[PDB]
Amino acid sequence: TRQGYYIRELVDIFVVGQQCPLFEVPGPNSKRANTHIRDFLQVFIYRLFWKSKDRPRRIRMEDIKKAFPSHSESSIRKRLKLCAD
């Protein structure tokens, strides 16, 4: 860590074979992919509103632009359309 080194011994190590997947990874540009993209952004926006101390709760746009910098700001504008002014 930042403060120093720490040492443990280990005695047990597992080898994991070939995985049998139980969850389907979406494809690129899929409907499930884009749904997750906007849902994740919406959850981050709600949790930034919960963390806000001023009443009424207020956030800044460039916090979201620091978190999601590949997003066009139009997508963020629409996620803020419903729930913020």
Added chain:
DNA sequence: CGTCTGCTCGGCTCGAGTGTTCGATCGCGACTGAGGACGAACGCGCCCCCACCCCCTTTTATAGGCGCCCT
């Protein structure tokens, strides 16, 4: 006037639903090939019947040979 944020609108992409076509076994059906059994006709064998020829005797002349019977 420039920047930024939001709102609307347009275009593109992807997913889902449906309908048509084809094949995927397929589940019967038709139909010909393969295989003894029974009845009728023939030829065919077997049996029976018919036909023909000789044997029963008598006679009579006549004679050589073989066998038997009582004198």
